[PDB]
Design a protein around this ligand. Structure first.
Ligand SMILES: *[C@@H]1O[C@H](CO)[C@@H](O)[C@H](O)[C@H]1NC(C)=O
Lengths: 21, 29
């Protein structure tokens, strides 16, 4: 959605990061 | 998170899976 896109375009060793489900 | 070219293989976005194949249909997991 356009509001979702506007929200998306506003928020920017041994330490892995698990991806969300 | 390992591109396992240095170790049935399917590559997810969470890593690579060994021992499980890929199925087109979907069910509640
Ligand atoms: C794994 O490496 C190959 C070659 O370096 C690359 O083509 C492939 O996209 C890589 N896997 C992922 C999930 O990016």
């Amino acid at each position: 959605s356009p509001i979702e896109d506007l929200l998306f375009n506003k928020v920017t060793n041994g330490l892995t990061v698990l991806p969300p489900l | 998170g390992v591109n396992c070219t240095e170790v049935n293989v399917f590559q997810t976005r969470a890593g690579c899976l060994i021992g499980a194949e890929y199925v087109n249909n979907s069910y509640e997991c």
